[PDB]
Amino acid sequence: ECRVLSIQSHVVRGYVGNRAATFPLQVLGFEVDAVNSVQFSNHTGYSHWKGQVLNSDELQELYDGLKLNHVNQYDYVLTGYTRDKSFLAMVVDIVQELKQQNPRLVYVCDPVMGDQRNGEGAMYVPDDLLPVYREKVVPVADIITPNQFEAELLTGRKIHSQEEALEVMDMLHSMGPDTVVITSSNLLSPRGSDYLMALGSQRTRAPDGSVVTQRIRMEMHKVDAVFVGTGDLFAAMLLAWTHKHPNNLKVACEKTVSAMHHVLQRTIKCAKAKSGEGVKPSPAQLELRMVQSKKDIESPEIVVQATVL
């Protein structure tokens, strides 16, 4: 039995934030407790959107409810896209007290702040969130899944190669997270302009306090569409696989990214099968075919090989 506390957004239609993390973790055998940080008709990639957001105090209300009935015991805490700095400071308090109620509680954090386009990245969230993620959040994170744009901001050091990209990660580990994964970066992969490159190193503390920093590289064949929520579906499954492979980041990212590709391919197909030739598919048709990728989520056919080091 493994109980995860997933504090992310919810949407009536589509798979983003919690909608993107729940079903996977559930079919992967996990016990998902979901706090919906917001509830909107759909993600903001759409033309329109309406909805309500959960504030800082309401997040707490729900936590006290859990605490009062003495059911605030968890094995994992998964947080993602957040706009409110007060809401995030609240997430840190919760995570710190949950780590006191004691389990080898693993805090999987996706430091969502924006994405990267070659020279400068467009920040999604307000810049008053960076300090908090850097100063209060990451320090208590165990597994963080940033962008390259995110890894950079977090360390205040920009990335221009695989080499200095591992230097940013080493810098990250120092802040607290023993596991880091750069889910996507500008870096040209040894496979061509056609492949996206993911990076990630695990600084394991083996018996007798030795150092162990296994680093890896993943190459996912890109896809002709702009998907929403892939970051969320990723961190969720990563959570799942790193549980199965606690010291084998290699196999965890493999299974993770492999299932990633299976769902994205199945998605881009139905989006196309649902859109005439010459017309670009809509955020609506690009929604992940989640329910359909069940088995693939359950048992990912390894079509990717993690390059050790």
Ligand SMILES: CC[C@H](CO)Nc1nc(N(C)Cc2ccccc2)c2ncn(C(C)C)c2n1
């Ligand atoms: C930031 C950009 C995107 C749009 O492409 N919109 C969006 N919108 C989201 N929405 C669904 C939540 C939401 C709705 C209204 C205001 C704030 C947050 C959302 N939840 C997780 N994610 C990403 C990080 C996978 C979400 N992304």
